[PDB]
C-alpha cells in the first residue's frame, strides 16, 4: 500500500494561538523517536483529539493496498480494494511545496515537506531521509488512528 | 477531503471546480498578518490568508474582493489573460 | 503482455534517465539476501576469462549458500561446517580428485556445482559439532568394514565384475568420491546389461544397473554404532566383527538409501526383519496391491505425458507373434489377502552382520520385480486380429507367480508356476493336462532366457520351441 511515511505521534499543543476557523484545531505535534514534528489541522467535531494523545499516522500513496492509482473518484460502491479501512481518519490531499535547507554545494537533511488536505494543512517536518518519498502535485492520503 | 470518519467535501474542493483549466495565481485575502510573511508558518499559514492557485485548484486561503473582484491581478484577470473569454464567462456564471 | 507492459514503462521513462535512477538509488541508500541470490544467478551467465571465471566460483559459493575465502589468485576455499574444498574440520585435505580438478579445467562449471551439491547434501547431518565428527568418523569406519568384506571376496574368488554385482558379497562397492557416497550395485538386470553385448571390464558405469547408497543419517531415536573399524580380526572365509565396546550412542543408525524405491512386498519385510529387527517401515503407512506398484516403477522409469490406462491389461509386440498379459492383481493368496507391498527407499541397519541377510532378501525381491517388470509396457494395440496371444498372471503365493496360456498346438490351458527362490534363481514347473503335446524342455527355456533377457521373451520361447517340434 506504498506507506510512505509512519510513526506513533504524541499531540503537544492543540492551537498555539487561538481557535481561528471553528471547528478545524491546528494540533502541533512532536512525534516520538524519529523526532519529526507535525502541524496537522483536524476536523474537531468528527475527530474529537484531546491534548497528549499518541496516534498513528501513515502518509500512504494509495488506500486500496493491492497498488494502482486512485482515478481521483469518489467510487463510492466499490469495496473491491479492501483498503485501509482499519485507520479512522481519512483525509486525502495534495503536496504543495518540498521546502528544504540546502546551500548551493549541498542537498539539506531538513527536508520540509507541506502537504495540503482540501484546504485543512500539514507540515510535516524532519530528517530528509524519512520524508524521501514524498513528490510534488501527489494526492497522498493521510490515515490516523489513536493508539492508547 | 475528509473520507473514513464520513464523506464530508471541502468548500475550497467545490470552488476548484468552477475554475477555469490551469491558472497560477497568489494574492493575499483582505485580512492579511503584516508579519506571518517573514516569520515561520509562512507557507501554512496560521489564519488562511495567502490565496494560493496551482493548476487551477485552490490550494490555500481565503477568497477576498482583491483575489476575486476588480483589480489588477485579480483571479478573473489572470483568467481573461490566459483561457479566454467565453471560458471566462460560463466561469463567472458557475461561481454566482 | 508482462514484456508489453515493460516496453510501456520503458517508453514511460523515456518520456519522462538512467542517470536519475542512480541518483534516486543513492537517495535511498542514505535514507538484501534476495538481492545477494541474483547477483550469484547474473554472475552464472557471466563467462569470460580466468579472473572473471574466479567471480564464477565465487558466485558458485554464494548459489549454494556457502562462504569463500580466497588466498592468493590460485586458491579459492569455499567453507561450511567440515564441508572446506580449495580449489588451487576433523580431517585432512582428502585427495585431488581427478573428477572435480578434470571438470574445473574444462569448460564445466555446472558439473563442479553439482559436485558441492552433493556434498552439502551428505552433510546436512543435523546433530551439533563434536557429536558429527564422530558420526562422520562411524560412517568411515562402515565404509573401511565394507571395503574390506568386498576384498575378501575377490581373494576367495577372481570373480569378474559382473558375477560380483549379481552373487556376491556386498556389491561391486566404488568408494566415496567427493559428494558421492558408496554405492553397491545390488543387482545388473540381463536385458540392460546388453545395450542395443556389453562387457563390463572393471569400467562398469556408475548407473549402469540397479544401485543403493551406503550413508549416515540422524534418526528420532538414539542406536549404537562403532566408532572404530570392527574388523579388527577376520576369520579367512567370510568375515569375523570384534563386539562393540568402540561405539556411542549417536541419535542416527547407517541407512541403505536407494535412489529410485523398490516395490517391495509384505511377506518380505517379515523375511527381512527375521533377521535385523530393526522395522522396516515403523510408522505402518499405506500398503496395497505390489502389481500395481510393479506397474507404477516399470511404467515411471520412463516418463510420457499421458497415463497408459493399462487396466492391468499391457500389450507387448515381439519380433514374432504379438502378446497380451494381464497382471491379475487382487487373484487371493493362499491366506486369502492378495499381495501387498509398499515402496521402500532407505533401509536402516546398525551394523554389517545382518547385512549380507538383509541383501539376500532384496535380491530375491528386486529379481522377481525385474521379470514381472520386463513385461510392463506403453504398447496402443487396439483392435489386433492376428494373434494376440493372450496371457495372465495371478499372485499364487508370496514369491510365486503363475503365466497361463492356450496350449500352442493343442486346446488346453497350459500354466507355467515360477517362485523366484533368489535374486538371480527363479525355478519354474509346466503344468499341462494328462493328454497333450510335450510343449518344452525347462532347460532349453533357460538357456535362451539367461543368453538374452526378461519375461514377455520367456513366453516366446516357450511357444517357439513347442512350434519348432
Given amino acids: 500500500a506504498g506507506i510512505l511515511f509512519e510513526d506513533i505521534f504524541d499531540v503537544k499543543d492543540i492551537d498555539p494561538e487561538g481557535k481561528k476557523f471553528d471547528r478545524v484545531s491546528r494540533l502541533h505535534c512532536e512525534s516520538e523517536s524519529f523526532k519529526m514534528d507535525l502541524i496537522l489541522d483536524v476536523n474537531i467535531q468528527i475527530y474529537p483529539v484531546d491534548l497528549g494523545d499518541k496516534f498513528r499516522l501513515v502518509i500512504a500513496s494509495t488506500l486500496y493496498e493491492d497498488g494502482t492509482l486512485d482515478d481521483g473518484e469518489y467510487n463510492p460502491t466499490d469495496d473491491r480494494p479492501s483498503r485501509a479501512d482499519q485507520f479512522e481518519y481519512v483525509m486525502y490531499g495534495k503536496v504543495y511545496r518540498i521546502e528544504g535547507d540546502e546551500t548551493s554545494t549541498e542537498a539539506a537533511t531538513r527536508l520540509s ?33 489513536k493508539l492508547a | 477531503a475528509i ?11 467545490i470552488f476548484s471546480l468552477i475554475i477555469p483549466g490551469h491558472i497560477n495565481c497568489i494574492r493575499t485575502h483582505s485580512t492579511h498578518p503584516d508579519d506571518e510573511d517573514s516569520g515561520p508558518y509562512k507557507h501554512i499559514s496560521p489564519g488562511d490568508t495567502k490565496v494560493v492557485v496551482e493548476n487551477g485548484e485552490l490550494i490555500m486561503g481565503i477568497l477576498c474582493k482583491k483575489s476575486l473582484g476588480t483589480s489588477a491581478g485579480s483571479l478573473v484577470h489572470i483568467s481573461y489573460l490566459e483561457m479566454g473569454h467565453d471560458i471566462t464567462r460560463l466561469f463567472y456564471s458557475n461561481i454566482q | 503482455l508482462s514484456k508489453m507492459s515493460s516496453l510501456l514503462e520503458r517508453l514511460h521513462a523515456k518520456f519522462n534517465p538512467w542517470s536519475e535512477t542512480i541518483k534516486l538509488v543513492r537517495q535511498v541508500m542514505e535514507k538484501q539476501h534476495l538481492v545477494s541470490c541474483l547477483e550469484t544467478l547474473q554472475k552464472a551467465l557471466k563467462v569470460t576469462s580466468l579472473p572473471a571465471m574466479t567471480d564464477r566460483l565465487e558466485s558458485i559459493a554464494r548459489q549454494n549458500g556457502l562462504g569463500s575465502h580466497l588466498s592468493a589468485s590460485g586458491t579459492e576455499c569455499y567453507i561450511t561446517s567440515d564441508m572446506f574444498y580449495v580449489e588451487v574440520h576433523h580431517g585432512e585435505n582428502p585427495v585431488s580428485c581427478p573428477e572435480l580438478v578434470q571438470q574445473l579445467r574444462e569448460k564445466n562449471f555446472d558439473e563442479f556445482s553439482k559436485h558441492l551439491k552433493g556434498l552439502v547434501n551428505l552433510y546436512n547431518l543435523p546433530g551439533d559439532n563434536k557429536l558429527k565428527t564422530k558420526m562422520y568418523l562411524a560412517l568411515q569406519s ?26 556376491g558379497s556386498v556389491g561391486y562397492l566404488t568408494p566415496r568420491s567427493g559428494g558421492h557416497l558408496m554405492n553397491l550395485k545390488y543387482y545388473v538386470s540381463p536385458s540392460d546389461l546388453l545395450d542395443d553385448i556389453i562387457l563390463h571390464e572393471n569400467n562398469v558405469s556408475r548407473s549402469l544397473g540397479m544401485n543403493a547408497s551406503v550413508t549416515i543419517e540422524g534418526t528420532s531415536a538414539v542406536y549404537k554404532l562403532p566408532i572404530a573399524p570392527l574388523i579388527m580380526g577376520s576369520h579367512p572365509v567370510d568375515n569375523k566383527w570384534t563386539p562393540s565396546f568402540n561405539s556411542v550412542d549417536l ?30 517401515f515403523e510408522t505402518q503407512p499405506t500398503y496395497a496391491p505390489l502389481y500395481e506398484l510393479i506397474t507404477q516403477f516399470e511404467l515411471s522409469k520412463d516418463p510420457d505425458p499421458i497415463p497408459l490406462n493399462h487396466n492391468m491389461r499391457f500389450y507387448a509386440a515381439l519380433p514374432g507373434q504379438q502378446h497380451c498379459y494381464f497382471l491379475n492383481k487382487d487373484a487371493p493368496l493362499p491366506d486369502g489377502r492378495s499381495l501387498q507391498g509398499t515402496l521402500v527407499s532407505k533401509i536402516t541397519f546398525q551394523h554389517p552382520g545382518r547385512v549380507p541377510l538383509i541383501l539376500n532378501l532384496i535380491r530375491h525381491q528386486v529379481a522377481y520385480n525385474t521379470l514381472i517388470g520386463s513385461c510392463v509396457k506403453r504398447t ?19 514369491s510365486r507367480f503363475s503365466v497361463s496360456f492356450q496350449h500352442p498346438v493343442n486346446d488346453s490351458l497350459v500354466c507355467v508356476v515360477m517362485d523366484v527362490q533368489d535374486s538371480t534363481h527363479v525355478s519354474c514347473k509346466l503344468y499341462k493336462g494328462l493328454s497333450d503335446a510335450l510343449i518344452c524342455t525347462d532347460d532349453f527355456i533357460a538357456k535362451v532366457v539367461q543368453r538374452c533377457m526378461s519375461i514377455p521373451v520367456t513366453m516366446r520361447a516357450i511357444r517357439r520351441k513347442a512350434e519348432t517340434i
Fill in chain 1, 113 to 145: 515537506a507541506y502537504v495540503s488536505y482540501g484546504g485543512l494543512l500539514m507540515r510535516l517536518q524532519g530528517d530528509a531521509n524519512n520524508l524521501h518519498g514524498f513528490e510534488v502535485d501527489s494526492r497522498v492520503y493521510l490515515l490516523m488512528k
Fill in chain 2, 3 to 13: 473520507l473514513k470518519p464520513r464523506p464530508l467535501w471541502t468548500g475550497k474542493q
Fill in chain 3, 142 to 167: 562402515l565404509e573401511q568394514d565394507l571395503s574390506k568384506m568386498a576384498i575378501m571376496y575377490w581373494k576367495a574368488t577372481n570373480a569378474g565384475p559382473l558375477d560380483k554385482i549379481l552373487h
Fill in chain 3, 251 to 280: 541419535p542416527a543408525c547407517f541407512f541403505l538409501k536407494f535412489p529410485q524405491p523398490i516395490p517391495v512386498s509384505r511377506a518380505f519385510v517379515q523375511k527381512l526383519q527375521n533377521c535385523t529387527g530393526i522395522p522396516l
Fill in chain 3, 380 to 398: 496402443i494395440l487396439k483392435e489386433d486380429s492376428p494373434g494376440l496371444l493372450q496371457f495372465e498372471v495371478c499372485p499364487l503365493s508370496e
